[PDB]
Design a protein around this nucleic acid. Sequence first.
DNA 1: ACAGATCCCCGGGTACCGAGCTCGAATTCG
DNA 2: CGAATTCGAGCTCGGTACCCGGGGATC
Lengths: 266, 1088
Amino acid sequence: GAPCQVVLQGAELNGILQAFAPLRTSLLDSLLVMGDRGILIHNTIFGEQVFLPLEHSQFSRYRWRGPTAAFLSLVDQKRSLLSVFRANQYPDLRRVELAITGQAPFRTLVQRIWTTTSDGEAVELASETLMKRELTSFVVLVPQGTPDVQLRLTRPQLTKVLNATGADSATPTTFELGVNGKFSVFTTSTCVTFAARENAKTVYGENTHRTFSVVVDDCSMRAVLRRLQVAGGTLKFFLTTPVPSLCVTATGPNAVSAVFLLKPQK
Amino acid sequence: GPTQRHTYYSECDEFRFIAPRVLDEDAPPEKRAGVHDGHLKRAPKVYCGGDERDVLRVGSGGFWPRRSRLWGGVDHAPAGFNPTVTVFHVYDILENVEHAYGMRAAQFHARFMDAITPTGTVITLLGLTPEGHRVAVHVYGTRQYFYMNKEEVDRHLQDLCERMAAALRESPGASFRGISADHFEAEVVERTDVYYYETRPALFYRVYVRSGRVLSYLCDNFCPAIKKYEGGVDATTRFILDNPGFVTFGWYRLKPGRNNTLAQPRAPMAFGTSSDVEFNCTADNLAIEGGMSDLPAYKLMCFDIECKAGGEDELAFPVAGHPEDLVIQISCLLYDLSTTALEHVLLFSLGSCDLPESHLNELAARGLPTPVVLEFDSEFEMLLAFMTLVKQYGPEFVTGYNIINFDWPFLLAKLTDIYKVPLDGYGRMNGRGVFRVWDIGQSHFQKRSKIKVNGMVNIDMYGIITDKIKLSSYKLNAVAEAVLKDKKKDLSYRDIPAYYATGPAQRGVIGEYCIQDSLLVGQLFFKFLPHLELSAVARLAGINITRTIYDGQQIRVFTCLLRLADQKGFILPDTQGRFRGAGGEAGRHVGYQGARVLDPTSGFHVNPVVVFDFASLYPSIIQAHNLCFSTLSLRADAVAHLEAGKDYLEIEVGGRRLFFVKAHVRESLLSILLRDWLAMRKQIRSRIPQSSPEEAVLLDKQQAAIKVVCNSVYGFTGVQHGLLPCLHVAATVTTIGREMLLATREYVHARWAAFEQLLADFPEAADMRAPGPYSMRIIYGDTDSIFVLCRGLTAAGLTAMGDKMASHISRALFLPPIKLECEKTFTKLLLIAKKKYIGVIYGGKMLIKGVDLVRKNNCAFINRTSRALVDLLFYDDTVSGAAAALAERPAEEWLARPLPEGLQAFGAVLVDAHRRITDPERDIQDFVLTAELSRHPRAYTNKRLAHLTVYYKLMARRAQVPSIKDRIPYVIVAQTREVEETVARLARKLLVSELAEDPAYAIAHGVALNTDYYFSHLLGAACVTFKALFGNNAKITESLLKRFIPEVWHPPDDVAARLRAAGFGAVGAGATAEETRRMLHRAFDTLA
DNA sequence: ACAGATCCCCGGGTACCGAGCTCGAATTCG
DNA sequence: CGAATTCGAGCTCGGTACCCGGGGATC
Ligand SMILES: [Mg+2]
Ligand SMILES: [Mg+2]
Ligand SMILES: [Mg+2]
């Protein structure tokens, strides 16, 4: 019936339930952008950009046709299209059916939930099922390119770095990879240093030789990255282009990422 | 010379020349701004065509119509001028307390000199002789009088003993003096108190006072323990109720009353009122002769003010007290009130004035007299000419637009403060008269700003059009547009002293706007003819016209009750110590339970909803069960000699179990008072079926205006601290009302709820059966209605038979005066809330009853759009079907399943209303909210109010300060950083109160409006009416109605400049539609 | 020196508790 | 030795109840 039918069947659904769980009540003001390739989730968190791809393999099957739609997630302005995945709401879940039946401008998306009943049974609760509608005209600025030094900065040390950052605008922190892979987060208060490679200070990345020094002037980096509560697992660095961008990705089952703008250097 | 001397300027040689020093171009550009000041030794002067005639020289013949016979004594009438008059028309009765030593050269007859002999009260009747002469007939010998129990005056004090006591008991802190035996009379008379059926006749002293001091005795001075019985009745009412049949606006005749005594014209030099022929009849030389039904050429004047403001700021609304803010020019149209004719179109100007030839030609092309423009060099010498016109020409009726608030108080404030000239003589009596404007704005308890002038009936049209039409903003431009289908061209004040500083060719444009304004006023007065409609109630009540315009509704009802009281051996007690002594026991006070509102079965109701209405319910409960004070026995001793059910009624009203006596052992006064008024509303409802569809609407509002004065009977009873409060009768009235509705519902449900019982009672319904299943189910009531949803019946003749149901239920349940009527039948009624409903009458007009679209606050823009949504629901067809389809599923179940494909037309007007709000080419005057000031703004408990905020913004920037009860316009201006330093300088998601702004200030300074406020308010209005379809919860509708509106997202632009600069891609609208997909495909590989 | 009534719904502006929020200064736990 | 849980204190802001006040409906 609906051309664009996407379903989360139980094994994959408990995959994405754990992927969404850590980000408690963040991204429930998201903007879901859905195209042929999955679904991407966007938001401003402490005035900074944050993203979450949901590519096909994540959930059971995806089928989509026509223009990419964008659904301003907060549905009826208190309830949220992604509430279903908060990992303690609707606890013993089963198949969730996102489908959109419209045509191109005025698409509308129905989130149908199903809830176990312990025989193998399940009750579709058509009491909390959601009905959103496509934003008519939506412009969202999405990261692009390929980073030039992606290092894997793992779970402890991505606390060390955010603590190494400072409180307010007085004190700009400075990421500076030097020759032979120093990768130090310098600032007036304290400094954290690493080995950059291709014994638990071996920060594994690739093509790290392309030296940079960059300075982060947003005081928010600890704020948002902690708010997301990432386990770390990569800093993505885009140096080439003006106002180089520091994005940061986690490596658990989720892929939430947060682009940090930086002041002109390298 | 005269005996009663005249107190109106008849001569002058010194005044306060004030003349803005722009009229004299013999000074360079430095002495242009400002105004002169300083006395002069010339007698004042008017130029009209290039003639000089000192303003106060009656004689050769003036630039104005002289309609007087006297001027400063010197009789200016043709010699031998002795009209005989015996049929005169009276419009205003005055009381004046003249004296015997004050009139000795009057040469009266001895009868008259005896009437006043110490002093006395002389009722001047005042009017026109049909030929045209202004007659003033002075009627002597009318004494006001108050009664007092014989016992209580025989203990507190302990006939001539009484008056000798009371005469000098007044003495302390003298304001009276020389008060002797001959100033009061007692006589023992035998009468019953009005209250309760148990109350026996007793013996009272009738105290006849000589003049206008009863109010002292009836004030707490004399003896507070003694209950004075009727002390508020005037000399005038004691003249109108005891001479039988006399009416205070009606033709009289002058008859040789008794002894063959004869009325006595005065000599011209003893005239108490500047009029042509004056007479000294007594109480009973008059007769009331009828059959003559005419209105004798009373000259209505219709005048306006235009005022300038000077000294150091020109864009400042002028203020009366300032010697420099000064009146420039005033229209004065003079009409004839018998033929609706216009003559003489006078305009008074301060200095040279022309008039554009367009104005003179438009007027002559309308058959209106050529304007007469009088050029006065000095402002005082203008406002003396103007109140020499209103004392020589002597308009009986006066009119204006906002005369009570801005025109007259400016003019009088300017005379009395700044030029110090008595206004007491410029009324109709040439000395010791009343010329007063009472403003409400004195932190007070009244609702009227009253002007009383001595013998002139100041019918303002702001009152009248604020009681006849339900219009958001009552400024003359808008009321001319709405009421006359006209297009007026305004002149905002701000540009007045730019048209004045130029030569006369722009003072002419000011005179154009004055005359064209006051001719419009004249047109509204003759459209609504207030003088006839207030005349009818002045006749019916006994109050003057001047007291039926400005003194509320307890007085007309008390006065009719007083004429019924003192013909039945009754006396009407006077309770005093009113509310600033309050109720004596040593948020809004509801003195009793008032009415029922049955629960509305909220919903759209496609089936015929046939309404039944009691016909003026309360006044037929004060008659069906003869509820008055006089039958109120509220104990059970005095109704013991009569039997239950046939001679009295028991009603637990508050728990009291009042016993109300039946009709044949005592008859009410409220039942009998109401019988006269009801036939008056019955004649004004008679005339409706035979009139024009626009002259029917004025005889619709005259019958509503008497529905209020008949139901005021009930009201007047139920007031607290009023003139005759009896909350027992009012509580009962409402009790029987609530009961009568529940009786009707337990009869319509039990009797007619199987269709075969309809067929056995009205066999004309055999063919009225529409196919569906039958149910007669009352779904709504109100103080009289009962909306009977009749399901399974065709609407075609449901009013045909419904006249029969309303005649069956009436006869079968209620007493014969009570009449249930089937006034309407709706099809497609929407029952949104308790007193709110929209429904389309059978085959035609829509009845919108109070849904935030029938009320004066809400912005015009939002009223046009919900007014189109209601049409898209009732009149349209797919939408009506769809709306009815939104009953199949509870409210919750439309938040998932889409709206059933008929309402895509409903939503279009919401997305389109949202598209229009955002356009930068909006017109502020379409987005203007407005709300009533309603109180002195310092008496407000809650001071953080939108309109209040705009009232202080107005008054702070020297602008027009809207007098109490003026609708304050206010548009809500965008929240910006200039609406946030202004609050802080005057002191952060700002309240709607502190974004209020006057639209004059919102157009001259190009401020944005809130497009969040006004659209959230449009969905607020839409939601309140349309909740009724969805379940009647406003949260579901608010969530479903706004789903229609497209939502759009962009990064806050500068951030996009930075992001773009960071080399991101824009994905959507800001690109075109094939730049979004390809690059958003790349972004995924980036983050993946 | 003045003077019909009550009932009723919304909207704006307060002033709570509170349920849900992360966000820490001890922690129990590896 | 380790730095990985917690039940405490700060948050919002929903959403209650409140008043008021505007302004209808009904007599
Ligand atoms: Mg005016
Ligand atoms: Mg009625
Ligand atoms: Mg009727």
